[PDB]
């Protein structure tokens, strides 16, 4: 089991960490959503699906910088929505193919009522999402840590 981003940055067997750089809607008004869809950015596969079933959860999702201060949100994982920052580990998604498939996570953020101006700065860390992988074969229990970075500023009109 291993993962890679849309630009080919990989995290190999055993876990580790990688940066994910995201383009963000440049203008978001109070009452509107900023959607950060990681299903187009993070992909994983099972290396031995003939014998092993891999189990993948969103173990934890934390907010940083402008997302922590200026937005409220939820995280959608494999069809269900949860609070973001997260309060617990999600149920598991099965990875049973050697063909890469997306990690089905997206953040649904909305500016807080008093947000205004440059609500997210270009180059800043916005979130850390931990993918936890286990299996039905041995004791492997690994973390694939995804550091989500903004490619651009996001302005909330005042």
**Measured from the CB atom, is 84 or 144 closer to ligand KGM?**
144
Please tell me the distance from the alpha carbon of residue 104 to that of residue 30, in angstroms, as a whole number: 26
With CB under 5 to 8 Å by kind, the binding choice for 139 among ligand KGM, Na ion, none is: Na ion
Binding flags for ligand KGM, 14-53, as an x/- string (CB under 6 A):
--------------------------------xxx---x-
Please tell me the distance from the alpha carbon of residue 129 to that of residue 103, in angstroms, as a whole number: 11
Q: CA nearest 91: which of 61, 63, 59? A: 59
Distances (CA, A) of 107 to 30, 48, 52, 71: 16, 30, 30, 11
With CB under 5 to 8 Å by kind, the binding choice for 43 among ligand KGM, Na ion, none is: none
With CB under 5 to 8 Å by kind, the binding choice for 42 among ligand KGM, Na ion, none is: none
Task: Report which DSSP code applies to 67.
Answer: H
What are the residues binding ligand KGM (CB under 6 A)? Answer: 1, 13, 46-48, 52, 54, 135, 137, 140
């Amino acid at each position: 089991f291993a993962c890679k981003t849309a630009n080919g940055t990989a995290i190999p067997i055993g876990g580790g960490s990688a940066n994910v750089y995201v383009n963000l809607a440049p203008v978001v008004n109070v009452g509107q959503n900023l959607v950060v869809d990681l299903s187009t950015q993070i992909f994983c596969h099972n290396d031995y699906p003939e014998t092993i079933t891999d189990y993948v959860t969103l173990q934890r999702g934390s907010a940083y910088g402008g997302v922590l201060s200026n937005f409220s949100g939820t995280v959608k994982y494999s069809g269900s929505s949860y609070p973001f920052p997260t309060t617990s580990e999600t149920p598991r998604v099965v990875y049973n193919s050697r063909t890469d498939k997306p990690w089905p996570v997206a953040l649904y953020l909305t500016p807080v009522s008093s947000a205004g101006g440059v609500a997210i700065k270009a180059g800043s860390l916005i979130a850390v999402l931990i993918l936890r992988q286990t299996n039905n074969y041995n004791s492997d229990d690994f973390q694939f840590v995804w550091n989500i970075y903004a490619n651009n500023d996001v302005v909330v009109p005042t």
